[PDB]
Amino acid sequence: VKKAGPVQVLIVKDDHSFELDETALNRILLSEAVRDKEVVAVSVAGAFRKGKSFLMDFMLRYMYNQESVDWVGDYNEPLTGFSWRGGSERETTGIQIWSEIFLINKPDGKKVAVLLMDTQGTFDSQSTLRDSATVFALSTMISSIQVYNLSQNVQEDDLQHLQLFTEYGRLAMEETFLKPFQSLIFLVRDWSFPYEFSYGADGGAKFLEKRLKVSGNQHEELQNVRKHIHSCFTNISCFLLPHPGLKVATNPNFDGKLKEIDDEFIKNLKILIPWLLSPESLDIKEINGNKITCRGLVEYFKAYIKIYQGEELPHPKSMLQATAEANNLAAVATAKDTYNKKMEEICGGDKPFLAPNDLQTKHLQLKEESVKLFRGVKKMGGEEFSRRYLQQLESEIDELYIQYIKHNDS
Numbered sequence: 001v002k003k004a005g006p007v008q009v010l011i012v013k014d015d016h017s018f019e020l021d022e023t024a025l026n027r028i029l030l031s032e033a034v035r036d037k038e039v040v041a042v043s044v045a046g047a048f049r050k051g052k053s054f055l056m057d058f059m060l061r062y063m064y065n066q067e068s069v070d071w072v073g074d075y076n077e078p079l080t081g082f083s084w085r086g087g088s089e090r091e092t093t094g095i096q097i098w099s100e101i102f103l104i105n106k107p108d109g110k111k112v113a114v115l116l117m118d119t120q121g122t123f124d125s126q127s128t129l130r131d132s133a134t135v136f137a138l139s140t141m142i143s144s145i146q147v148y149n150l151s152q153n154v155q156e157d158d159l160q161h162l163q164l165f166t167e168y169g170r171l172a173m174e175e176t177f178l179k180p181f182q183s184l185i186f187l188v189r190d191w192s193f194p195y196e197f198s199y200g201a202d203g204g205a206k207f208l209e210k211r212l213k214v215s216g217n218q219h220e221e222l223q224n225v226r227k228h229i230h231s232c233f234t235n236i237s238c239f240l241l242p243h244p245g246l247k248v249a250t251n252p253n254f255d256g257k258l259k260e261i262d263d264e265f266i267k268n269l270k271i272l273i274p275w276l277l278s279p280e281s282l283d284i285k286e287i288n289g290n291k292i293t294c295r296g297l298v299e300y301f302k303a304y305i306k307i308y309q310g311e312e313l314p315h316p317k318s319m320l321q322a323t324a325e326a327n328n329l330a331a332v333a334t335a336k337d338t339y340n341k342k343m344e345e346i347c348g349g350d351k352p353f354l355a356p357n358d359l360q361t362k363h364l365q366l367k368e369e370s371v372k373l374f375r376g377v378k379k380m381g382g383e384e385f386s387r388r389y390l391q392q393l394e395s396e397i398d399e400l401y402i403q404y405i406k407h408n409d410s
């Protein structure tokens with residue numbers, strides 16, 4: 001009673017709560033016509049306004065029209081037909097699936113159910129990071145190709161976010177000799193240095209090599225991005241997509257003829273889409289080595305959500321917070337150290353059991369000297385932030401002093 005279209009299946013409300021739409025999820029992947037078929041699950045995932053819907057709009061044009069030279073459409077007429085682009089576009093965090101599941105014939109002769117999802121999150125604060133990261137983990141767990149839609153390059157935060165949500169994924173799942181996830185494509189959206197690396201998969205491949213080999217190693221432990229990434233996915237690639245031109249770029253709801261999109265962009269879109277979605281390359285989802293059915297998929301999805309709802313996912317700590325904290329603990333540690341070294345320098349060892357009166361005055365002297373030491377030193381927090389650490393130093397020195405009176409009363 002309604003055309004085919006995009007439907008919200010997972011959303012994160014202001015409550016920071018994850019709202020799963022069971023009946024919507026059921027009505028779509030528990031249709032008898034599909035419920036028992038092996039499912040290929042393709043996901044485009046990224047921040048808001050990164051061009052995902054536009055890309056998936058062409059994906060639909062292909063999925064609906066397996067015919068030569070039309071799948072892209074008529075060079076002289078606008079884009080038309082089914083669309084993920086809804087108009088009054090709210091920024092939201094979650095997953096949309098295309099309501100129409102496609103049945104497609106493989107080279108083997110299998111009839112697979114092809115599932116298309118949009119995976120979206122916002123990254124504007126350490127609070128929304130947690131939510132996006134768990135929405136991206138769920139997406140990647142439930143999909144067989146995760147096309148990670150990035151904008152100009154692969155920035156440090158892009159990789160950090162990728163590790164963080166694969167990390168979240170690993171938590172909710174039991175470890176095996178197999179890799180936790182299948183495919184991952186770094187899709188770079190507005191590549192503008194073709195003279196360095198080419199538009200496309202050849203060129204992308206090369207670029208991702210250089211990027212991953214830097215950092216290089218990070219972050220601090222020997223958990224460097226390349227190893228981490230490669231140990232999570234079975235296949236990793238990267239496509240370099242050109243800029244679509246100013247009309248597409250500055251026009252929300254673009255609606256001009258195909259001809260007004262940049263020619264190099266259409267040309268590469270023409271190879272990218274089938275590169276991902278052609279019957280040959282279509283790739284059946286599997287978990288623990290076993291191919292999944294649309295129904296199987298639904299049960300894992302409900303299941304995975306259950307787990308994350310039960311236990312708490314680690315809250316991310318920002319770089320600025322982390323490095324400030326560290327800078328202050330070092331001040332704290334330096335000052336404690338100096339206090340301690342001098343306290344045994346003075347009072348052993350038992351040395352001369354000292355009048356609790358005399359030991360105390362040596363303690364106050366030394367505490368003051370190391371508290372004075374604790375200020376004067378450059379610290380990132382700002383006074384209000386470092387005050388807490390100053391308490392820390394006093395709290396700890398006192399405790400380190402209580403031990404020193406025992407050793408003395410001997």
Ligand SMILES: Nc1nc2c(ncn2[C@@H]2O[C@H](COP(=O)(O)OP(=O)(O)O)[C@@H](O)[C@H]2O)c(=O)[nH]1
Nearest residue numbers: 048049050051052053054248249251252253254
């Ligand atoms: N610069 C650039 N803009 C794009 C691209 N694809 C779409 N756009 C435009 O960017 C805006 C956001 O597009 P949209 O697909 O709705 O972004 P989404 O929220 O990630 O789905 C729209 O004006 C699009 O016409 C692209 O590859 N590069």
Ligand SMILES: [Mg+2]
Nearest residue numbers: 052053084118
């Ligand atoms: Mg969108």
